[PDB]
Design a protein around this ligand. Structure first.
Ligand SMILES: *[C@@H]1O[C@H](CO)[C@@H](O)[C@H](O)[C@H]1NC(C)=O
Lengths: 49, 48
């Protein structure tokens, strides 16, 4: 997300065992880094290997 | 800065946006050079 140009990156990594769709369970994310870039982001794309 | 920024009759290195289609939110930089259109007549990049 962004606040007045402050990009909030919240990262959480937990191991799971899943077939498809989504598992049912509670998760509380934690902040990772902060990038006060101050630019408008109208679009995004996911990079893959 | 008058003893510095003032050169001859003017200094064009410092420019500004006089016209905008609306009020821009604070803490925003607008580099768009598009001609401001106050009417319904298309400007097509020239004054009129
Ligand atoms: C980003 O651009 C969108 C689409 O023009 C606009 O609706 C929005 O207000 C802009 N946000 C910021 C933070 O400049």
């Amino acid at each position: 997300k962004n606040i007045d140009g402050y990009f909030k990156i919240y990262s959480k990594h937990t191991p799971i065992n899943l077939v498809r769709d989504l598992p049912q369970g509670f998760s509380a994310l934690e902040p990772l880094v902060d990038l006060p870039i101050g630019i408008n982001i109208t679009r995004f794309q996911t990079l893959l290997a | 800065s008058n003893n510095l920024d003032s050169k001859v009759g003017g200094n064009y290195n410092y420019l500004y946006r006089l016209f905008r289609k609306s009020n821009l939110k604070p803490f925003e930089r607008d580099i768009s050079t598009e001609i401001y259109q106050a009417g319904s007549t298309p400007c097509n990049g020239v004054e009129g």
